[PDB]
């Protein structure tokens, strides 16, 4: 079928420049009213742009949060539509989509990309330090044991948590990473009986592919 | 006030072929690879208003069926969204089956000529272990499998004949079977207009209804998205027709006329 | 240069149950109009074109109606996939602009908060650093108010909560709060204490513990 | 017609060389099946065997090829005969609208294919109409003068016929 495929996300720096790649993939009736689209996370969407087709004289369109600080162009034997972003601000940190009309005449966007990620932060690679979460020394209440484990202080996104590599998920809560200060900070709960606990060992698998480090944590009582 | 159906034209220079008609001049098309051209949008015939009887609207750039209204407050051209990606989808559907149709080919032409490669290769070996490497009945044995070979071409070269007209013709009747659907579509779009509004607007024959009653922009609307309240502009509707026992005489001019609303048509027309 | 005020911005029903978003357009749009529906971690995807225009493989509960500037979308009747989020778009003149957005969620039957508090590790205490964490899990509905009370005394900076997505098994938000704090600092104070105020209860539901752990 | 003939022309050659290898074929498994008697040896037989069965089909590989090329030969004479009659009711028409737009009202149409004049054209003239030199404001008076030469209408000749108005007389609405 039709394929949006963007790619040129990652990090930059404020202030900066960043050129994403929208390539469309597939028998095209017409690759016409290319749209740019981004949407900050939990946030709504947000339209940049379109840029016409050869065939209309690849004449383009803007909003006035984004003209003249963003162009919308497409190459000129690859089938490639491009995005060139200057002096990026951190409100520019944002998931951003490519979209187009079915065929011609613009009555909506039928084709959508995957998308592509743009983080506009300082920042460092940063490894996290895994902790453990053990209950209160107190006697805690009814059968049933609630654990945890924090992996504070780390950058960029994403790390994957799994209890047990995978054998433990149901019961499970891993939350949204907030950033704390300049660096990324989230947490994971886990509820089950008081029977599987302490007696059996439950572990907290860490992974955070930028820094290259995996770190496995035991939880221990007392 | 007046309504008019209507379609899409520009300044598109691409031709198709039907079967009957060579070289038409469409607004839209699709390249296939072979010398087939598929078209997509429809025939391109640009240009008081007229209809759509003697022209495509190359100010309507919205869609491809559409109407041009006129009234007290403005005019302006207006392409039925619905009807056109109806249009649309429809024939992409049909162009993509052609494309899927294709591929195999390419994929069967792929096929052949890895296997073609194959065999000489294959053959060449035998023809160089007859000199390197019941002796004679190895040799006779492998001028058979060659000359099954050459058998074998002139084969796949029928079939790539017989493919590329099936393939021509295919394009040459879906491009009249398309041709014929756009033409479809528009005379849908005013039958149904001509439906809604009965009487209370007079045919003008080239495609247009001049209203009897004062229609704004919002009755406008109503003609387009099929809620026209006809009994409501019944009455001044009834009045404007009569208010304009043999009858006169047609105007001596070479040209045939015919009788309706106590005016004198032309024959041409109908 | 033309406004799209989509409401509401969220909306709860159950299955079955029907839901109209309306998307109010500043100026005069006709019947250039649009809407999606974007899946988590996921693209938006056509449903309504045309105003009143069902795009292809769309279901039939799905429909758009209005024209000018007042537009609705309904749903007949819900089910599990549908609460999603949806966004209405205008293709009338650039900017094609969007609306806000309006968030579904399922309506269940309310549920307490697993609440329980967590001492600091002693793997923190080593780098000079400690956090109190507080897990509010699996409650409905979502709105929830968590309040630190070190010594006694409510805490403010150095709170940060998180939230997740009403859960796809148990339509449950669940909730983190990690109070930081120096080392220095959480020696000198003993008693932590974190108040969850819920739906659930009218007397606010808490955990805490004395420092008198070690 | 030609491009027909060509057309015809690769096929008959085709049909040519399909036989000159066909019979090279039998000609060489005859030798094979005589020098599996005159002259591991049962691994050559069924080899043999193998490339007579691929030969039958070969053959009903032939055979569907021909049925096929015939009924697209067929088709394209059905298909080229349409677009031929076709062709010949599009000239003459041409040279029809030709003629109607160099006399324009200075000759009435007839309807059945010809113009009465509304003034005398002798064999020069008539010439100008042919090679398209058609001097229409040179009799364009005499022209202008005859026509109304010869306020309601008088009534069609009842006899079951639709009859349409035009100068000033009814003709058959069946001409049209
Ligand atoms: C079809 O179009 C008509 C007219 O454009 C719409 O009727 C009007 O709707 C607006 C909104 O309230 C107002 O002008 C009136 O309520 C209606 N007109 C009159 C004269 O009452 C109608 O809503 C449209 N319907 C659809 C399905 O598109
Ligand atoms: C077209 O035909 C007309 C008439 O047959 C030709 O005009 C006449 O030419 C001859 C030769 O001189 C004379 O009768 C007159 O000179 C012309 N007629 C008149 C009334 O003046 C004309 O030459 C022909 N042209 C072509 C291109 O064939
Ligand atoms: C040719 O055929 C062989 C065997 O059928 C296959 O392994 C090979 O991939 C083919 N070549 C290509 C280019 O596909
Ligand atoms: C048959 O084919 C052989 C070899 O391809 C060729 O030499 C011979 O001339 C052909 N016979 C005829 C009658 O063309």
Same mark, same amino acid.
Not at chain 1, 82 to 97: G, I, K, P
Not at chain 2, 83 to 111: F, H, L, P, Y
Not at chain 2, 155 to 164: A, H, P, S, Y
Not at chain 2, 169 to 197: A, C, G, I, M, P
């Given at each position: ?6 790619? !040129?996300? &990652? ?14 993939? !597939? ?29 209309? &004289? ?36 944002? +998931? ?6 079915? &065929? ?7 084709? *959508?990309?995957? !998308? ?23 006697? +805690? ?11 504070? &202080? ?8 799994? *209890?047990?590599? !995978? ?25 089950? +009986? ?8 439950? +572990? ?19 | ?57 190359? #100010? ?6 559409? @109407?041009?209204?006129? $009234? ?27 494309? =899927?149709?294709?591929? #195999? ?18 053959? =060449?070996?035998?023809? $160089? ?60 779009? @005013? ?41 409501? @502009? ?7 027709? =009569? ?13 045939? @006329?015919?009788?309706?609303? #106590? ?8 | ?214």
């Amino acid at each position: 079928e039709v394929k949006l495929v963007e790619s !040129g996300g &990652g990090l930059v720096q404020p202030g900066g420049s960043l050129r994403l790649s929208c390539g469309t993939s !597939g028998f095209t009736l017409t690759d016409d009213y290319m749209t740019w689209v981004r949407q900050p996370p939990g946030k709504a969407l947000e339209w940049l742009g379109f840029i016409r087709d050869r065939a209309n &004289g690849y004449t383009t369109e803007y909003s006035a949060s984004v003209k003249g600080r963003f162009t919308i162009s497409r190459d000129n034997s690859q089938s490639i539509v491009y995005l060139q972003m200057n002096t990026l601000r951190v409100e520019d940190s944002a +998931t951003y989509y490519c979209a187009r009309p079915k &065929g011609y005449f613009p009555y909506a966007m039928d084709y *959508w990309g995957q !998308g592509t990620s743009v983080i506009v932060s300082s920042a460092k690679t940063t490894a996290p330090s895994v902790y453990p979460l053990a209950p209160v020394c107190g006697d +805690t209440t009814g059968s049933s044991v609630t654990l945890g484990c924090l992996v504070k &202080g780390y950058f960029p996104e994403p790390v994957t948590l799994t *209890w047990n590599s !995978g054998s433990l998920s149901s019961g499970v809560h891993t939350f949204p990473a907030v950033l704390q200060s300049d660096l990324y900070t989230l947490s994971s709960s886990v509820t089950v +009986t008081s029977s599987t606990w302490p007696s059996q060992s439950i +572990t907290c698998n860490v992974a955070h592919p930028a820094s290259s480090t995996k770190v496995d944590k035991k939880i221990e009582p007392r | 006030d007046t309504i008019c159906i209507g379609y899409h034209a520009n300044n598109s220079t691409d031709t198709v072929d039907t079967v009957l008609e060579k070289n038409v001049t469409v607004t839209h098309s699709v390249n296939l690879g072979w010398g087939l051209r598929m078209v997509t949008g429809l025939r391109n015939i640009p240009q008081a208003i007229a209809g759509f009887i003697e022209g495509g609207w190359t #100010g309507m750039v919205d869609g491809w069926y559409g @109407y041009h209204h006129q $009234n007290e407050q403005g005019s302006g051209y207006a392409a039925d969204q619905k009807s056109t990606q109806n249009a649309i989808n429809g024939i992409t559907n049909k162009v993509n089956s052609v494309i =899927e149709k294709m591929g #195999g080919w390419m994929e069967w032409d792929r096929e052949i000529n890895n296997y073609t490669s194959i065999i000489y290769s294959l053959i =060449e070996e035998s023809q $160089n272990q007859q000199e390197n490497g019941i002796v004679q009945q190895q040799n006779n044995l492998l001028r058979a499998i060659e000359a099954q070979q050459h058998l074998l071409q002139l084969t796949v070269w029928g079939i790539k004949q017989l493919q590329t007209y099936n393939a021509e013709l295919l394009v040459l009747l879906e491009n009249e079977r398309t041709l014929d659907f756009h033409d479809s579509n528009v005379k849908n779009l @005013y039958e149904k207009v001509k439906s809604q509004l009965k009487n209370n607007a007079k045919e003008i024959g080239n495609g247009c209804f001049e209203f009897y009653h004062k229609c704004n922009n919002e009755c406008m609307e109503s003609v387009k998205n099929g809620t026209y309240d006809y009994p409501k @502009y019944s009455e001044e509707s009834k009045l404007n027709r =009569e208010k304009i026992g043999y009858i006169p005489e047609a105007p001596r001019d070479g040209q045939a @006329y015919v009788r309706k609303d #106590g005016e004198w048509v032309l024959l041409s027309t109908f | 240069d033309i406004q799209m005020t989509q409401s509401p911005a969220s909306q709860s029903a159950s299955l079955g149950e029907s839901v109209t978003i309306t998307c109010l357009a500043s100026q005069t749009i006709g019947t250039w109009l649009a809407w999606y529906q974007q899946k988590p971690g996921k693209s938006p995807q056509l449903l309504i074109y045309a105003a009143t225009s069902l795009a292809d493989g769309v279901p039939s509960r799905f429909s758009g109606s209005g024209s000018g500037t007042k537009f609705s979308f309904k749903i007949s009747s819900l089910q599990a996939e549908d609460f999603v989020s949806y966004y209405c778009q205008q293709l009338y003149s650039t900017p094609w602009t969007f609306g806000g957005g309006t968030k579904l969620e399922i309506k269940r039957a309310d549920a307490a908060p697993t609440v329980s508090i967590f001492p600091p590790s002693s793997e923190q205490l080593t780098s000079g650093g400690a956090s109190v964490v507080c897990f509010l899990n699996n409650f409905y509905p979502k709105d929830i108010n968590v309040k630190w009370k070190i010594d006694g005394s409510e805490r403010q900076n150095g709170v940060l909560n998180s939230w997740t997505d009403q859960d796809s098994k148990d339509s449950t938000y669940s909730m983190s709060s990690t109070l930081t704090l120096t080392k220095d600092e959480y020696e000198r104070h003993n008693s932590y204490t974190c108040e969850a105020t819920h739906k659930t209860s009218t007397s606010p539901i808490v955990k805490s513990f004395n420092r008198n752990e070690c």
